Design a protein around this nucleic acid. Structure first.
Ligand SMILES: [Mg+2]
Ligand SMILES: [Mg+2]
Ligand SMILES: [Mg+2]
Ligand SMILES: [Mg+2]
Ligand SMILES: [Mg+2]
Ligand SMILES: [Mg+2]
Ligand SMILES: [Mg+2]
Ligand SMILES: [Mg+2]
Ligand SMILES: [Mg+2]
Ligand SMILES: [Mg+2]
Ligand SMILES: [Mg+2]
Ligand SMILES: [Mg+2]
Ligand SMILES: [Mg+2]
Ligand SMILES: [Mg+2]
Ligand SMILES: [Mg+2]
Ligand SMILES: [Mg+2]
Ligand SMILES: [Mg+2]
Ligand SMILES: [Mg+2]
Ligand SMILES: [Mg+2]
Ligand SMILES: [Mg+2]
Ligand SMILES: [Mg+2]
Ligand SMILES: [Mg+2]
Ligand SMILES: [Mg+2]
Ligand SMILES: [Mg+2]
Ligand SMILES: [Mg+2]
Ligand SMILES: [Mg+2]
Ligand SMILES: [Mg+2]
Ligand SMILES: [Mg+2]
Ligand SMILES: [Mg+2]
Ligand SMILES: [Mg+2]
Ligand SMILES: [Mg+2]
Ligand SMILES: [Mg+2]
Ligand SMILES: [Mg+2]
Ligand SMILES: [Mg+2]
Ligand SMILES: [Mg+2]
Ligand SMILES: [Mg+2]
Ligand SMILES: [Mg+2]
Ligand SMILES: [Mg+2]
Ligand SMILES: [Mg+2]
Ligand SMILES: [Mg+2]
Ligand SMILES: [Mg+2]
Ligand SMILES: [Mg+2]
Ligand SMILES: [Mg+2]
Ligand SMILES: [Mg+2]
Ligand SMILES: [Mg+2]
Ligand SMILES: [Mg+2]
Ligand SMILES: [Mg+2]
Ligand SMILES: [Mg+2]
Ligand SMILES: [Mg+2]
Ligand SMILES: [Mg+2]
Ligand SMILES: [Mg+2]
Ligand SMILES: [Mg+2]
Ligand SMILES: [Mg+2]
Ligand SMILES: [Mg+2]
Ligand SMILES: [Mg+2]
Ligand SMILES: [Mg+2]
Ligand SMILES: [Mg+2]
Ligand SMILES: [Mg+2]
Ligand SMILES: [Mg+2]
Ligand SMILES: [Mg+2]
Ligand SMILES: [Mg+2]
Ligand SMILES: [Mg+2]
Ligand SMILES: [Mg+2]
Ligand SMILES: [Mg+2]
Ligand SMILES: [Mg+2]
Ligand SMILES: [Mg+2]
Ligand SMILES: [Mg+2]
Ligand SMILES: [Mg+2]
Ligand SMILES: [Mg+2]
Ligand SMILES: [Mg+2]
Ligand SMILES: [Mg+2]
Ligand SMILES: [Mg+2]
Ligand SMILES: [Mg+2]
Ligand SMILES: [Mg+2]
Ligand SMILES: [Mg+2]
Ligand SMILES: [Mg+2]
Ligand SMILES: [Mg+2]
Ligand SMILES: [Mg+2]
Ligand SMILES: [Mg+2]
Ligand SMILES: [Mg+2]
Ligand SMILES: [Mg+2]
Ligand SMILES: [Mg+2]
Ligand SMILES: [Mg+2]
Ligand SMILES: [Mg+2]
Ligand SMILES: [Mg+2]
Ligand SMILES: [Mg+2]
Ligand SMILES: [Mg+2]
Ligand SMILES: [Mg+2]
Ligand SMILES: [Mg+2]
Ligand SMILES: [Mg+2]
Ligand SMILES: [Mg+2]
Ligand SMILES: [Mg+2]
Ligand SMILES: [Mg+2]
Ligand SMILES: [Mg+2]
Ligand SMILES: [Mg+2]
Ligand SMILES: [Mg+2]
Ligand SMILES: [Mg+2]
Ligand SMILES: [Mg+2]
Ligand SMILES: [Mg+2]
Ligand SMILES: [Mg+2]
Ligand SMILES: [Mg+2]
Ligand SMILES: [Mg+2]
Ligand SMILES: [Mg+2]
Ligand SMILES: [Mg+2]
Ligand SMILES: [Mg+2]
Ligand SMILES: [Mg+2]
Ligand SMILES: [Mg+2]
Ligand SMILES: [Mg+2]
Ligand SMILES: [Mg+2]
Ligand SMILES: [Mg+2]
Lengths: 117, 151, 137, 112, 52
RNA sequence: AGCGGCACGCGAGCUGGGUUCAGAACGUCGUGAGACAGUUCGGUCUCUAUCCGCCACGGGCGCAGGAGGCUUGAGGGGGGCUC
RNA sequence: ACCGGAGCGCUGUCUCGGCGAGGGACCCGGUGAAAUUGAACUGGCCGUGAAGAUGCGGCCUACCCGUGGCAGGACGAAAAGA
RNA sequence: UCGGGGCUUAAGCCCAGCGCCGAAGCUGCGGGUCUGGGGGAUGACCCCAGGCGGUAGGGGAGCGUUCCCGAUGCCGAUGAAGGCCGACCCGCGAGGGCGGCUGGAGGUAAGGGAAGUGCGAAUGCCGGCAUGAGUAACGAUAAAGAGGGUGAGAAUCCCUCUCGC
RNA sequence: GGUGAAAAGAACCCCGGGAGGGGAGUGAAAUAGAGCCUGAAACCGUGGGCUUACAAGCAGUCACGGCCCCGCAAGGGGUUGU
């Protein structure tokens, strides 16, 4: 009983060329160039999913510290204040309040100010 | 494989790969690697199991109710239509596969062509064929010889 | 899902120059070229205020920087390395010395280069009195 | 409507006939007849010849008017190549592909 | 062969790019005054002729 | 009438006298075949540059009306000798 | 037609190069290869790294695409180092 | 050129202090798998805790390919195998379904058996098509020019004259 | 090695020196049209969408934004500017 390659190999290749659509030049036409590209692609994403946490950990901090200093105080103090008062709210992201809903930020500012001193 | 032995090319400063003869399995057309040769597939199953199985098969088809001994083969005279008539009387409506065991050469000739029937000599009784069929039916002269092999 | 600003509006600004420590001042200017002070900060769009400096020909600087500090400049050719000292920068093109700093403090990419274009430095003042000009400090 | 014509297996490299085809894609029939008429390339002759046939079909098979048909589209595809050997210095031999072309012109009524 | 040789297959991109200046240009033509047809300027052509 | 670096700069630039294949000989060593930072005569150096770089020369587009002519010089380069 | 030294004659061997001829090179029309080729969106310096980097870091520089030329690099090609 | 910019009661060094930033570490929330303990008379399943980087290598559980029993069966012209497409469904995954198009005569469940059973590399073997590139070259530097003719087409075929070897 | 169940292998007209096509015709099917079943991939080409001429690259990934396309919708697909 001989089991020639048959369809098996084509389908496995074809299945990867899909995955690699849109890649530059040979990386999307050649199975071998494709697989190589996809290898790194998987790792790049996995590493970037951990990154995306930090990409915003930051963005928010700037944006916060930004509006934060309009009120005369700085982020590193603002957090000392909030954290001092036990105001565990405003998970950094929600301190988008600095943007829309400014008054509430101004509120949280005084609260943190009163807490610190 | 039918090729020569000559070393296809010198293997040095040729620049080509490196090879011996076309016969080598890396070449297409070359010889097969661990491809199959003819071999014996049989083995000697312990006799005591050849028995137990046979008995157990006949038993299974009895505990099931499907077994039926007979002798009143009036449908003698090797002619399918006759055995076909005897079949109905005996409740073998041809609804289920049957392993008809009998010493009778004619009754054999009769039932032979029915697609739902498996004629068979008494000595030929065996596990596979029993299990294949849905119902065992055999003449009493047969049930003596099966009872003889083991019983 | 985090906020994202719309088409902003170029806030302009007017900075002095006299007496300001070159680098110290240069920092503040940069942070203004980027948002970083505007709470709707967006690192891929550029919306930092336009900056306009004047009287740059008066910038302070500590140490002996006026003779010590020298600016290098490579041309493709052999020996093409030029060594121009601070003293000579101000003596000739003086707005130059303020640029070589802030530019060196902006990001590197294509956007960073756009930001540099949002900077206007003069020795004067007498800058082109377009519109906005809220002097700062 | 539209009427096509195709000359297959023309002994001439596609890369070379294509230049002449690009030269008349979408132009009028009268314009092309002139262009191909004074274009200095072996390919012109062929592209012209298929161009002419494309017209007769348009008229004698599809009613459309000569006074107002043009090259809606056109193109050349590569057909099977005649490979030949070629003795070379020191006994080595090269194969040389005398390539081939399928030339296609498709015409259409000017306006409506 | 001997000494220099390409270090890498040219990409279909770079290849076509090289060829950006290969395109032809239509022949310059003018309607001949005598006949109705077209001629290449400064030249005589069949189905026509010239004056003296 | 400087000394060094640049794969003791540079053989896809050249040469090939020297070294460093096969021939042959001298002195020398070895029974020998042979051997020698010992010597001597002879001895095939590969048309086609893809990319970077370099010398030149065009095509495209841009320069937020279109065009003809004249120009400023940021930034480079050349020169720099001596009796 | 062996290998070394010298001299006379004569010379583009040289100081030191110039001009000219023809056959190529170059442009147009016809036909149309090759070694090579992981894939390429393939710059400079100073570092750095398996100790000699277009691909890492910092900095400088650089509009997109070709054509005729040069051979410093791609530890260029060739030959699984003799 | 201290990574750069740039820094002088510092953005340097020394001593003291309060902050904040900062990993795939730790916490929060959800999920998987294994292991252990417990409820489950119960398989199923539920709960709690703990472990889960990995080359040589050991162990375990699966996926697909060819063929055999299951086949005098079953699916198939109201469309088999194969091919092309899919942003859908299931699986951790190898995979399996489903829908559309193509294709036009085969296919083979559940459950088992047997192997020529899975390829990206071997300067592998065979074939196909690329790159260099419209590039080098068109094979002796004895040499060509015109008129006339034939022909769908003529520098290249025929004739004449001139020239050269 | 393979048209199709069967040559029914395409009369006739049209462009062309021919080749090859366009109609007409046969056939269930002609993208079964004659090295003709199926017709994958590399490779070449035509049209359409998004995109690119101040830009630094193992060609991807993450995020946001613009354009084009699907669905009444929340949404999804393609592309790529930073
Ligand atoms: Mg195999
Ligand atoms: Mg033989
Ligand atoms: Mg032998
Ligand atoms: Mg043999
Ligand atoms: Mg060898
Ligand atoms: Mg064989
Ligand atoms: Mg039977
Ligand atoms: Mg100093
Ligand atoms: Mg970027
Ligand atoms: Mg980038
Ligand atoms: Mg001297
Ligand atoms: Mg020295
Ligand atoms: Mg030197
Ligand atoms: Mg060397
Ligand atoms: Mg040295
Ligand atoms: Mg040397
Ligand atoms: Mg040499
Ligand atoms: Mg040398
Ligand atoms: Mg060499
Ligand atoms: Mg010599
Ligand atoms: Mg010498
Ligand atoms: Mg010598
Ligand atoms: Mg020697
Ligand atoms: Mg040797
Ligand atoms: Mg010797
Ligand atoms: Mg010595
Ligand atoms: Mg010698
Ligand atoms: Mg030579
Ligand atoms: Mg390179
Ligand atoms: Mg270089
Ligand atoms: Mg100047
Ligand atoms: Mg100068
Ligand atoms: Mg100079
Ligand atoms: Mg000089
Ligand atoms: Mg002699
Ligand atoms: Mg002399
Ligand atoms: Mg003379
Ligand atoms: Mg000299
Ligand atoms: Mg000449
Ligand atoms: Mg030539
Ligand atoms: Mg010649
Ligand atoms: Mg040519
Ligand atoms: Mg470049
Ligand atoms: Mg150094
Ligand atoms: Mg490193
Ligand atoms: Mg490293
Ligand atoms: Mg490198
Ligand atoms: Mg890195
Ligand atoms: Mg670098
Ligand atoms: Mg540069
Ligand atoms: Mg050329
Ligand atoms: Mg050249
Ligand atoms: Mg070179
Ligand atoms: Mg050269
Ligand atoms: Mg070299
Ligand atoms: Mg070796
Ligand atoms: Mg520093
Ligand atoms: Mg202090
Ligand atoms: Mg358990
Ligand atoms: Mg139990
Ligand atoms: Mg762990
Ligand atoms: Mg593990
Ligand atoms: Mg082990
Ligand atoms: Mg299993
Ligand atoms: Mg059944
Ligand atoms: Mg049926
Ligand atoms: Mg039917
Ligand atoms: Mg149905
Ligand atoms: Mg169908
Ligand atoms: Mg099968
Ligand atoms: Mg479901
Ligand atoms: Mg269908
Ligand atoms: Mg199907
Ligand atoms: Mg099975
Ligand atoms: Mg090879
Ligand atoms: Mg090789
Ligand atoms: Mg190689
Ligand atoms: Mg190999
Ligand atoms: Mg081959
Ligand atoms: Mg091959
Ligand atoms: Mg040539
Ligand atoms: Mg030749
Ligand atoms: Mg030529
Ligand atoms: Mg010849
Ligand atoms: Mg004539
Ligand atoms: Mg005549
Ligand atoms: Mg004619
Ligand atoms: Mg003639
Ligand atoms: Mg004739
Ligand atoms: Mg036939
Ligand atoms: Mg026809
Ligand atoms: Mg003829
Ligand atoms: Mg015909
Ligand atoms: Mg038709
Ligand atoms: Mg019909
Ligand atoms: Mg159909
Ligand atoms: Mg039809
Ligand atoms: Mg089809
Ligand atoms: Mg068909
Ligand atoms: Mg054919
Ligand atoms: Mg074919
Ligand atoms: Mg068939
Ligand atoms: Mg295809
Ligand atoms: Mg296109
Ligand atoms: Mg656009
Ligand atoms: Mg870019
Ligand atoms: Mg960079
Ligand atoms: Mg649209
Ligand atoms: Mg909707
Ligand atoms: Mg992108």
């Amino acid at each position: 009983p001989r089991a020639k390659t048959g369809v098996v190999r084509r389908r496995k290749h074809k299945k990867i060329l899909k995955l690699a659509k849109g890649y530059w030049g040979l990386r999307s036409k050649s199975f071998r160039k494709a697989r190589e590209t996809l290898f790194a692609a998987g790792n790049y994403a996995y590493a970037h999913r951990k990154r995306r946490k930090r990409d915003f950990r930051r963005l928010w901090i700037v944006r916060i510290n930004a509006a934060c200093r309009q009120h005369g105080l700085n982020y590193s103090t603002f957090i000392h204040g909030l954290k001092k008062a036990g105001i565990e709210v405003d998970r950094k992201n929600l301190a988008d309040l600095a943007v829309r809903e400014p008054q509430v930020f101004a509120e949280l500012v005084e609260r943190a100010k009163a807490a610190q001193g | 494989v039918a090729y020569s032995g000559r070393k296809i090319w010198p293997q040095k400063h040729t620049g080509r790969a490196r090879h011996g003869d076309i016969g080598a399995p890396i070449f297409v057309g070359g010889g097969v690697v661990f491809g199959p040769k003819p071999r014996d597939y049989s083995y000697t199953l312990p006799k005591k199991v050849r028995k137990k199985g046979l008995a157990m098969a006949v038993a299974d088809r009895a505990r099931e109710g499907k077994l039926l001994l007979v002798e009143a083969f009036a449908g003698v005279n090797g002619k399918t239509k006759e055995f076909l008539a005897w079949a109905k009387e005996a409740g073998l409506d041809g609804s289920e596969s049957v392993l008809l065991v009998t010493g009778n050469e004619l009754v054999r000739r009769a039932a032979r062509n029915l697609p739902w029937v498996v004629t068979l000599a008494p000595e030929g009784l065996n596990v596979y064929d029993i299990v294949r069929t849905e119902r065992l039916v055999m003449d009493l002269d047969a049930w003596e010889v099966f009872q003889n092999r083991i019983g | 899902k985090t906020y994202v600003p719309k088409q902003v509006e170029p806030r302009w600004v007017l900075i002095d120059a006299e007496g300001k420590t070159l680098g110290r001042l240069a920092t503040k200017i940069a942070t203004l070229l980027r948002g970083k002070h505007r709470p709707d900060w967006t690192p891929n769009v550029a919306m930092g205020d336009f900056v306009v400096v004047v009287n740059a020909d008066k910038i302070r600087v500590t140490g002996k920087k006026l003779e010590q500090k020298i600016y290098t400049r490579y041309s493709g050719y052999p020996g093409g390395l030029k060594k121009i000292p601070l003293e000579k920068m101000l003596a000739t093109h003086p707005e130059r010395v303020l640029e070589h700093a802030v530019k060196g403090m902006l990001p590197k990419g294509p956007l960073g280069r756009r930001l540099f274009k949002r900077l206007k430095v003069y020795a004067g003042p007498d800058h082109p009195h377009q519109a906005q000009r809220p002097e700062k400090l | 409507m539209e009427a096509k014509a195709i000359a297959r297996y023309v002994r001439i490299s596609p890369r070379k006939v294509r230049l002449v085809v690009d030269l008349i894609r979408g132009k009028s029939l009268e314009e092309a007849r002139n262009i191909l008429r004074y274009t200095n390339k072996r390919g012109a002759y062929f592209v012209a010849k298929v161009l002419e046939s494309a017209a007769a079909n348009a008229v004698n098979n599809h009613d459309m008017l000569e006074d107002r048909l043009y090259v809606k589209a056109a193109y050349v595809d590569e057909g099977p190549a005649l490979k030949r050997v070629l003795p070379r210095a020191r006994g080595r031999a090269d194969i040389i592909k005398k390539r081939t072309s399928h030339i296609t012109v498709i015409l259409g009524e000017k306006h409506g | 062969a001997k000494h220099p040789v390409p270090k890498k297959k040219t990409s279909k991109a770079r290849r076509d790019a090289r060829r950006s200046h290969h395109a032809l240009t239509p022949p310059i033509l003018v309607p001949c005054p005598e006949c109705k047809a077209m001629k290449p300027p400064h030249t005589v052509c069949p189905e026509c002729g010239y004056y003296a």
